[PDB]
Scaffold this active site. Structure first.
Site, short mmCIF file in Angstrom:
data_model
loop_
_atom_site.label_atom_id
_atom_site.label_comp_id
_atom_site.label_asym_id
_atom_site.label_seq_id
_atom_site.Cartn_x
_atom_site.Cartn_y
_atom_site.Cartn_z
N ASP A 695 7.76 13.89 6.95
CA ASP A 695 7.59 12.70 6.13
C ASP A 695 8.91 12.18 5.55
O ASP A 695 8.89 11.18 4.83
CB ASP A 695 6.61 12.93 4.97
N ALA A 696 10.04 12.82 5.84
CA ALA A 696 11.31 12.36 5.30
C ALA A 696 11.88 11.23 6.15
O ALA A 696 11.46 11.01 7.29
CB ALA A 696 12.31 13.52 5.22
#
Ligand SMILES: Nc1nc2c(ncn2[C@@H]2O[C@H](COP(=O)(O)OP(=O)(O)OP(=O)(O)O)[C@@H](O)[C@H]2O)c(=O)[nH]1
Ligand SMILES: Nc1ncnc2c1ncn2[C@@H]1O[C@H](COP(=O)(O)OP(=O)(O)OP(=O)(O)O)C[C@H]1O
Ligand SMILES: [Zn+2]
Lengths: 731, 248, 422, 125, 99, 54, 50, 149, 60
Positions: A695-696
């Site tokens: 999710d980064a």
């Protein structure tokens, strides 16, 4: 502030003391005036909400009233006397922001797009959330811990509130009330309420074979005892009554006033109450078979109490307390003070009401002893994280449970929330399901007089319930008609009744907010007219063709007509949950079939304010939309045009905010494009350097250097230099 | 594993009925070792697992069958000589369900914990007719007790274990052969093992308290281990048997 | 669906209007009637109607238990006292039916007697529900109480003269507070005593089998001709509706009905302030055909101007003297001048340039945008075009109005050239 | 016992038989008229204010419609609650202040309800 | 996560910034995919958003096309500067001598 | 079944008099002797044959 | 963890024995498998398997 | 219940066939397909839901319950047990979900959220009890697990 | 304190507070007024004075 305050003042217009008769204090008319500040030396001066926020004071108006009393038997009147200060809501009728143009808003240092509707006390902005509760004066059939399918009813009148239950723990109906030592059979209560004939009791309960088979045990238990007359039944009741023939009198009083307060009795005439308990027992018997148990999560039986009702109750309680204090002071002063005649003006404490209101709005804990209501968390600090955050927090709804048990019933999304509340908008955490937001298009009804409603119901042929026995209640074609929980009577061919009532409401002789619903399983037609009910507008469809046409839409666009004209011309009408439960609605024109009565105005309106920002939400998942709303409630962006002059304990602004490219009609309506809370960046979906594993994301150094994502954090540091009791000051 | 499990549903174990509590609530009940559990299960093997007639016979033998569930009509007849309740047993339904219940067994079941009815009160006239003639007990009761009789009589047990409430015939369709077993939703393993036609040597139960009281502490330990392993495998997650052994 | 047959007439009788009561038995089915039961009397009251019937029941019938009759008689009455006895003999012979009042007003109810070709309606003065009352049980309870008291008093064989002289226990008639007095007034005992204060009236019973029944049954009819035009009952449907439902007592707040309820001048003013663009034909159609065209013209000429055959609301009507620009805050006079200049440019040419209008009026962009959107639309490669087309019909129909508007626009042009120095 | 309708009831009472029958009809609160010289106001006008004679007609159209023409308006008559208990119609005339007479006129079996045709009243104007 | 709405929004934003327009993402409606594909193919860009991209590190083209487009990113108040914490010995509580 | 007295309407109980069983009330001398046979059937729902599961 | 704003704690022992015990018993290289069933939890993840 | 099970089986068969068709028509080098094959993230179920067709929205292992009287939403007829009227989602996330389908998904979404989120308290309490009860045993040197006593 | 105080001084303080609140004066003014009233009551000549004397004392 316009009608309810006057009604409360009229209800508490006269107050007198027992000692020294011929003395009284009569209020004539109460006024609220315009918002003023008591800063100057005994001088009033208009103060703005921004100035109040800056100086950490309250934005209230001086409450004034005219009164008349008797000092020494000589009537003395006062045309204007202050008694308190009522915090004025922003953008209200008496507020200074209403009826102002953006230029005047800029002059007063206020944002035109500000939603308002919140109170300002001691500088902090508090919002009174909409409380949700169950509908009062309604029979609820539910299963007990041991599986017993019993009934309950919480009769709440303007004075008292009593919850009485009925159980079948031992095959017989035992009625339980908080004022009785032990639950007593229902047949004894029947005999005590005037109806002593077992035949009449059975006819009122029902004429079905299974009904008689299930009620037999109660008749047997009653015959086992020597209770056969109203006198004996009342004696038994009085003997079973707790401490607060004298026992018979107390039993009769409790049966007439305490039990089932919502059922009125003309003069100790318990016919209506007998019919009510008979219908309740019949419903309990019908439920004892097929498991048709009513659910609490059905919002058709929910009532939303806006800030108006809460403020009215608080003002009434404070006024009663002030009247009691004044009467006590009079009783203590007039008889033994001196020959000098005493008057109230010398003890009319003007700070009591002001302090009460300030505390009730700041602390948020409301403790009304006259009603035994101890609520907490009513007022919350308005989140100024962003314009969207404030606009979404303004339209929140709190539940009555308040995290008392992980039931999972009310926390779930019920189909009854269609078009009323936003299905996806819900805080993520422990408050998931208990905190909700209103839909984009909805309304909350108020209280009506009910006079013309009752008149039309009586003129439409509704037979008096006292004219015929309860045997007619067991027929399949005889449908009961209820009015706000009270049995209005009986009727036949309820289709004609409902059609005529709806036609009259559309014509306009009846208020458009009066709801009418019909339940065939119980054969009950409910006519709801109380406030707090959720309604939604719908276009009327007749014979496979909506009433609204392109000509009407063109007239509206050009300005020849308005929504009120549409409502008056029987084109669009408000529907309640219970009404749409029986009415048929269509989503689009192509979906309209022969069996259709209404048409959906717009589908996207199902979503709320926070959910309207989601571009193409129907292409994503539900938890995605929930998290998106939760993060938009905290998003960073501009608050208003007065964000520079505004001084808050914590504010977050963006350097170069940009409006979205894919904007929604909800965005255009809420004018969020004028105050965006983000920027459009050329994102490339791909994996790069392995620094975007879970999710980064990876940002560009040059983009960040050129001003992308630059934020500004504004904090406030406040210091006070006050004077103590002694003639010294902090320097 | 408590957090890993999502508390799913529709896991009827292949019967599409008999909702049983499995997951974190079941683990909680097991670790609590309550005397009474929710939805207890008892699995019993049959000596003749290939015949359905014997399976239904043992099912009728172990399952509680009330009088109102087998009698076609019960009428309180007041003849000018006397008043009495006449029950007509449906011999057709009796032989269809394969229950060894007749008028004699019905009469013997009557007069058991029912307001002390004497044997002389109940009589038999026909093959499937039962006549009950009560008498005033003088303890605040008179001849008008036929109502209480009509109320509490249809719920009298004539055949089966009172503790057993429901029993079903589960079928395993292994390619080698199709076998039958009994799944009882009761809380009495001793009675199921003592009833005729039940292979008590291969009878398992879900109630740890009953297992302990009946087959001993080692049997209770083994049942706990097996139940925990099954409840954990239902969710697709596996745990070493040593942990559950140490817990037990 | 037409009235092919059954054209029955309805007549009204006022002979038994105040002497007609409806007694209904909720516990007695319609199959069994009280025609064979001999009645004894009926106690009644003129005010607060509550009738109590006293009948007689047979004893020699097999449906009566003589032992239980003797028992209940000895329980309700004494051995041989017989001064106040609910039964003449030692058996339960009389039965008591008490009446309950259904509603206070019974004017909406009427008894309908059906004959061959006519239906006679007679008002009801009262409707009551008769149910078997249980007062002999209360009397038996009082009897048992006094018997227990006598037993407690005579517990000893010879009771010596008790010196129980009644001391003077005269309690104070204390001044009762208003709340306590209201409670006492609303107490059931007070209402019962008030009802009992009224004296009773005894009436005899005449069964349906008696000749008096058929003799008096004819009073429900009225002597009158078959066809008679009633003087009353001639109100219109609108009047009947108003009777059965009497009343309780942005700039588009007023609805269509609230607008029509206002004078023609105010109607036209509001319509123009709301729309700002509408033809005369559309205005006439919206106002209604019953209003005069000359009146509508005189009303619109004072609050609107003629622009290419169409009518545009004046600038002062939209911008009062005390108003200001909501975007810039400039006075309303400058806004009116700018709007007049825009209207003049539109009248001179159908295509108006926003940049030119702004450079001339020296105004900001938003004000010019609003002025242009109020009476025009955006057209690509052409600028701004009037929202409505050229209406020559009205120009040809009203030439004098056209000349008046032309001279007014010439004066406005002169004023604009003097102010802005065009 | 199937539920009857007013049209069939009147038909079987007039044609199939000729014996008179006592009916009980419930009229609206306010009738479409004015109290004739009753000292007023738009108050309620009940039968106590109207005089004797022909006051209205009872029409029976096709499809079972039963209407009551009581002037310029037309009400509709429907079958009320089917009462099965005993209903005895009596007249209690107090001819003298000390003694009166109770005369049983007949028995009531059926019940009717007259309602205003609000649909017609609305579509008229 | 089945977030096809994000891809639709990105494609609509690309079409809008290319054709000088503002597409609508109204729920249960809005601009369809065909309109934005037509806009892209008219302006000369790929009708699926993916465009030919060259690696910046190695300077060689990528074997798979990259999905570029404008997306409306919004920053949250959660800041690492505010969430950063490091506690030395520091003070303690009076009742219990603990941090 | 449940019978009521036509006189008062209270419940009737079956008792034994001096000649034959009869329905009588506990609040009035009304009685009713039994002439012929009277029955009150209920027809309880029989247990259906539970078929095999699987 | 999912790197969505989660806040994690970091502690520094103040004793050599505690340091050695943390490095030996709580070693990442020594705790590559869970004691529940012996399955390795420290392995490849998204963006690495693909 | 038989009709319910038959309808659920038919909907599951339709879902499986649609997923198989999508997997067979999709060409290699597809990113979702490659990720579902390698097991990094996603699966064929999610691929078919977001491409071919969304499955039956099951609430507590059953179809959408009738919130209103004899029907889930007023937009459907009374006593109507149709798939689209009871929870079936015919359209996919790519083509867009109808109002009723989105509402049922949110209802199922709410269900998921509450379950997982507040159930966790249950497992927290269970783990606390289990640890406080089992924190006394330890392995000795003689290969015998003994308690503290 | 507040225990070695007589009913007369308590009534005086309550009257001071009531008048301070009727005049809508701040709690700082209320505190200063009660403090000055206590300081004046410290003396005996004012302690044992008239009812009108103590009323005028509150006023002053
Ligand atoms: N971040 C954060 N939010 C909170 C906290 N407490 C409350 N909130 C938010 O605001 C709400 C509840 O605040 P309250 O718990 O009612 O404040 P309070 O407990 O009433 O204050 P007391 O009356 O003294 O108990 C929830 O809806 C949360 O969203 C907190 O400690 N931290
Ligand atoms: N109440 C809580 N108790 C323990 N951990 C929590 C709690 N709330 C959040 N967490 C932490 O956050 C994580 C929950 O994320 P998870 O539920 O797996 O994904 P999600 O929030 O459903 O995201 P999606 O909606 O699937 O995109 C796991 C846990 O360590
Ligand atoms: Zn009786």
């Amino acid at each position: 502030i316009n009608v309810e305050i006057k009604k409360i003042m009229k209800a508490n217009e006269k107050v007198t003391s027992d000692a020294d008769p011929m003395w009284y204090l009569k209020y004539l008319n109460i006024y609220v005036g315009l918002p003023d500040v008591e800063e100057s030396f005994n001088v009033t001066r208009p103060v703005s909400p921004h100035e109040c926020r800056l100086r950490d004071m309250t934005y209230s108006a001086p409450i004034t009233v005219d009164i008349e009393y008797t000092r020494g038997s000589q009537r003395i009147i006062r045309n204007a006397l202050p008694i308190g200060r009522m915090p004025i809501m922003l953008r209200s009728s008496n507020c200074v922001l209403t009826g102002k143009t953006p230029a005047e808003f800029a002059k007063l240092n206020e944002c035109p797009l500000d939603p308002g509707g919140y109170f300002i006390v001691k500088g902090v902005e508090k919002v009174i959330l909409i409380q949700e509760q169950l509908s009062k004066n309604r029979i609820i059939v539910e299963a007990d811990r041991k599986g017993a399918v019993g009934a309950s009813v919480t009769s709440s009148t303007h004075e008292k509130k009593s919850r009485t239950n009925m159980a079948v723990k031992q095959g017989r109906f035992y009625l339980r009330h908080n004022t009785l030592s032990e639950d007593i059979p229902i047949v004894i209560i029947f005999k005590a309420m005037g109806v002593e004939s077992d035949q009449e009791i059975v006819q009122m309960i029902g004429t079905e074979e299974h009904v008689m088979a299930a009620f037999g045990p109660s008749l047997e238990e009653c015959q086992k005892a020597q209770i056969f007359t109203q006198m004996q039944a009342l004696k038994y009741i009085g003997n079973k009554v707790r401490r607060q023939k004298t026992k018979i009198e107390e039993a009769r009083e409790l049966l007439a006033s305490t039990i089932l307060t919502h059922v009125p009795v003309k003069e100790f005439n318990f016919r209506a109450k007998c019919i009510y308990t008979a219908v309740m027992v019949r419903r309990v018997i019908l439920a004892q078979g097929d498991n048709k148990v009513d659910d609490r999560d059905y919002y058709g039986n929910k009532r939303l109490e806006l800030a108006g009702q809460l403020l009215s109750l608080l003002f009434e309680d404070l006024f009663k307390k002030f009247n009691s204090e004044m009467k006590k002071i009079a009783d203590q002063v007039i008889p033994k003070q001196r020959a000098a005649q005493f008057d109230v003006v010398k003890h009319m404490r003007q700070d009591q009401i002001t302090n009460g209101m300030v505390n009730a709005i700041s602390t948020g804990n409301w403790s009304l002893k006259r009603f035994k209501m101890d609520r907490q968390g009513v007022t919350q600090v308005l989140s100024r994280l962003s314009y969207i955050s404030a606009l979404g927090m303004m339209t929140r709804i709190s539940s009555q449970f308040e995290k008392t048990r992980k039931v999972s019933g009310p926390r779930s999304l019920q189909p009854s929330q269609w078009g009323m509340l936003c299905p996806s908008d819900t805080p993520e955490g422990e408050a998931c399901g208990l905190v909700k937001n209103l839909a984009l298009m909805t309304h909350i009804t108020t209280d009506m007089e009910d006079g013309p409603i009752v008149k039309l119901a009586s003129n439409l042929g509704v037979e008096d319930v006292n004219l015929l026995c309860g045997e007619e209640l067991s027929y399949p074609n005889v449908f009961l008609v209820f009015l706000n929980g009270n049995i209005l009577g009986v009727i036949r061919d309820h289709k004609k009744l409902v059609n005529t009532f709806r036609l009259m409401r559309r014509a306009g002789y009846i208020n458009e907010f009066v709801s009418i619903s019909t339940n065939l399983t119980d054969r009950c037609v409910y006519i709801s007219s109380d406030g707090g009910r959720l309604c939604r507008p719908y276009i009327i469809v007749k014979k496979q063709k909506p009433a609204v046409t392109n000509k009407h839409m063109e007239e509206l666009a050009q300005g020849y007509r308005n929504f009120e004209d549409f409502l008056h011309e029987s084109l669009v009408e408000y529907l309640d949950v219970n009404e749409e439960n029986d009415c048929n609605i269509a989503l689009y024109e192509h979906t309209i079939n022969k069996d259709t009565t209404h048409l959906e105005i717009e589908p996207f309106t199902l979503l709320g304010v926070c959910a309207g920002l989601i571009p193409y939400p129907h292409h994503n998942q539900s938890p995605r939309n929930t998290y998106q709303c939760a993060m938009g409630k905290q998003a960073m962006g501009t608050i208003g045009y007065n964000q520079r002059n505004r001084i808050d304990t914590l504010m977050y602004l963006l350097a170069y905010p940009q409006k979205p490219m894919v904007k929604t009609k909800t965005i255009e309506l809420i004018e969020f494009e004028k105050l965006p809370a983000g920027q459009n960046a050329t994102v490339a979906v791909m994996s790069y350097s392995g620094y975007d594993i879970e999710d980064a994301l990876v940002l560009n150094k040059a983009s960040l250097d050129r001003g992308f994502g630059r934020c500004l954090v504004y904090k406030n540091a406040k210091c006070t230099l006050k004077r103590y009791t002694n003639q010294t000051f902090d320097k | 594993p408590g957090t890993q499990m999502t508390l799913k549903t529709f896991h009827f174990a292949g019967v599409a009925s008999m909702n049983i509590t499995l997951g974190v609530p079941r683990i909680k009940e097991i670790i609590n070792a309550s005397k009474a559990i929710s939805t207890p299960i008892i699995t019993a093997q049959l000596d003749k697992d290939d015949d359905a007639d014997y399976a239904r016979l043992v099912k009728g033998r172990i399952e509680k069958t009330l009088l109102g569930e087998i009698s076609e009509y019960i009428e309180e007849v007041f003849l000018p000589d006397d008043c009495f309740i006449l029950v007509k047993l449906s011999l057709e339904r009796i032989r269809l369900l394969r229950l060894e219940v007749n008028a004699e067994t019905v009469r013997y079941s009557i007069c058991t914990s029912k307001l002390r009815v004497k044997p002389g009160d109940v009589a038999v006239h026909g093959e499937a007719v039962v006549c009950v003639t009560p008498r005033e007990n003088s303890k605040s009761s008179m001849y008008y007790v036929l109502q209480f009789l009509k109320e509490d009589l249809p719920k009298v047990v004539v055949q089966g274990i009172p503790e057993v409430s429901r029993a079903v015939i589960h079928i395993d369709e292994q390619s080698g052969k199709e076998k039958y077993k009994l799944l009882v939703e009761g809380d009495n393993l001793r009675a199921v093992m003592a009833t005729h036609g039940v292979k008590g040597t291969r009878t398992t139960s879900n109630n740890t308290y009953e297992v302990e009281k009946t087959l001993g502490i080692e049997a209770a330990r083994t049942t706990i281990i097996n139940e925990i392993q099954y409840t954990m495998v239902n969710h697709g997650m596996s745990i070493d048997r040593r942990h559950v052994m140490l817990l037990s | 669906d037409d009235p092919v047959v059954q054209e029955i007439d309805v007549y009204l009788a006022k002979s038994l209007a105040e002497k007609l009561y409806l007694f209904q038995y909720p516990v007695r089915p319609a199959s069994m009637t009280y025609d064979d039961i001999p009645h004894l009397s009926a106690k009644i009251k003129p005010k607060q109607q509550k009738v109590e019937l006293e009948m007689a029941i047979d004893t020699l019938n097999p449906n009566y238990c003589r032992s239980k009759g003797e028992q209940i008689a000895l329980n309700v009455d004494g051995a041989c006292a017989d001064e106040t006895s609910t039964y003449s003999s030692k058996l339960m012979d009389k039965q008591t039916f008490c009446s309950s009042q259904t509603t206070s007003n019974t004017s909406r109810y009427a008894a309908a007697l059906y004959r061959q070709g006519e239906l006679h309606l007679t008002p009801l003065h009262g409707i009551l529900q008769l149910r078997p009352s249980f007062s002999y049980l209360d009397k038996a309870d009082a009897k048992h109480r006094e018997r227990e008291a006598a037993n407690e008093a005579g517990d000893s064989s010879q009771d010596e003269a008790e010196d129980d002289v009644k001391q003077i226990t005269v309690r104070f008639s204390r001044p009762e507070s208003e709340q306590a007095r209201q409670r006492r007034v609303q107490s059931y005992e007070f209402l019962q005593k008030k009802h009992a204060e009224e004296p009773w009236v005894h009436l005899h019973y005449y069964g349906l089998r008696d000749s008096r029944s058929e003799h008096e049954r004819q009073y429900l009819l009225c002597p009158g001709s078959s066809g008679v035009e009633n003087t009353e009952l001639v109100k219109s449907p609108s009047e009947y509706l108003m009777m059965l439902m009497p009343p309780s007592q942005p700039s588009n707040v007023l609805s269509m009905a609230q607008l029509r309820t206002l004078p023609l001048a105010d109607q036209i003013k509001i319509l123009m302030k709301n729309v700002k663009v509408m033809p005369f034909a559309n205005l006439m159609s919206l106002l209604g055909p019953s209003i005069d065209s000359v009146a509508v013209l005189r009303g619109i000429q004072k609050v609107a101007m003629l622009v290419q055959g169409n009518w545009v609301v004046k600038s002062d009507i939209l911008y009062p003297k005390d108003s200001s620009s909501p975007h810039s805050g400039v006075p309303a006079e400058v806004l009116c001048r700018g709007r007049d200049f825009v209207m003049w440019k539109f009248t001179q040419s159908r295509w108006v340039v926003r940049k030119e209008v702004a450079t001339v009026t020296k105004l900001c962009a938003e004000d010019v945008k609003d002025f242009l959107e109020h009476m025009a639309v955006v057209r690509i490669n052409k600028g701004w075009e009037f929202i409505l087309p050229y209406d020559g019909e009205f120009i040809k129909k009203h030439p004098d109005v056209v000349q008046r508007q032309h001279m007014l626009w010439t004066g406005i042009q002169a004023k604009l050239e003097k102010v802005y120095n065009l | 016992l199937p539920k009857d309708v007013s049209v069939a009831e009147l038909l079987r009472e007039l044609s199939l038989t000729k014996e008179e029958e006592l009916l009980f009809l419930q009229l609206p609160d306010t009738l479409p008229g004015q109290p004739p010289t009753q000292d007023i106001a738009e108050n309620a006008c009940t039968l106590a204010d109207l005089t004797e004679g022909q006051v209205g007609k009872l029409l029976i159209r096709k499809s079972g419609r039963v209407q009551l023409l009581l002037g310029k308006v037309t009400l509709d008559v429907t079958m009320g609650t089917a009462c099965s208990f005993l209903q005895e119609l009596v007249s209690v005339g107090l001819g003298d202040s000390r003694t009166g007479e109770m005369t049983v006129l007949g028995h009531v079996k059926h019940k009717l309800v007259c309602s205003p045709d609000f649909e017609s009243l609305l579509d008229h104007k | 996560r089945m977030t096809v709405g994000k891809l639709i929004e990105l494609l609509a934003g690309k079409a809008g910034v290319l054709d000088g327009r503002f597409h609508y993402g109204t729920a249960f409606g809005g601009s369809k995919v065909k309109d934005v594909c037509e806009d892209l193919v008219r302006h000369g860009y790929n009708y699926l958003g993916k465009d030919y991209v060259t690696s910046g590190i190695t300077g060689e083209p990528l074997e798979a096309y990259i999905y570029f487009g404008p997306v409306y990113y919004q920053k949250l108040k959660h800041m690492v500067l505010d969430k950063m914490h490091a506690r030395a010995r520091g003070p303690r509580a009076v009742l219990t001598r603990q941090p | 079944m449940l019978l009521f007295c036509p006189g008062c309407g209270n419940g009737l109980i079956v008792e034994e008099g001096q000649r034959c069983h009869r329905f009588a009330c506990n609040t009035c001398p009304y009685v009713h002797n039994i002439t012929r046979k009277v029955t009150n059937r209920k027809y309880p729902k029989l247990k259906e044959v539970d078929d095999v599961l699987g | 963890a999912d790197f969505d704003g989660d806040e994690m704690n970091l502690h520094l022992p103040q004793t050599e024995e505690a340091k050695a015990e943390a490095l030996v018993l709580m070693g990442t290289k020594a705790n590559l498998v869970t004691p529940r069933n012996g399955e390795p939890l420290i392995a490849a993840i998204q963006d690495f398997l693909t | 219940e038989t009709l319910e099970a038959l309808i659920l089986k038919e909907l599951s068969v339709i879902r499986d066939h649609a997923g198989s068709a999508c997997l067979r028509e999709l060409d290699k080098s597809n990113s979702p397909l490659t990720m579902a094959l390698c097991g990094s993230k996603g699966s064929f179920i999610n691929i078919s839901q977001m491409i071919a067709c969304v499955g039956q929205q099951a609430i507590s292992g059953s179809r959408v319950p009738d919130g209103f009287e004899n029907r889930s939403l007023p937009h459907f007829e009374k006593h109507s047990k149709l798939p689209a009227a009871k929870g079936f989602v015919a359209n996919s996330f790519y083509s867009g979900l109808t109002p009723t389908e989105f509402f049922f998904h949110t209802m199922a979404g709410r269900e998921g959220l509450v379950d997982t989120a507040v159930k966790t308290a249950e497992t927290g309490y269970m783990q606390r009890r289990l640890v406080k009860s089992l924190e006394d045993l330890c392995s000795q040197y003689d290969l015998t697990v003994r308690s503290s006593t | 304190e507040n225990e070695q105080v007589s009913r007369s001084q308590q009534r005086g303080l309550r009257r001071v507070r009531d008048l301070c609140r009727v005049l809508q004066l701040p709690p700082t003014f209320e505190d200063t007024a009660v403090a000055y009233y206590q300081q004046a009551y410290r003396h005996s000549g004012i302690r044992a004075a008239r009812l009108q004397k103590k009323e005028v004392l509150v006023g002053c």
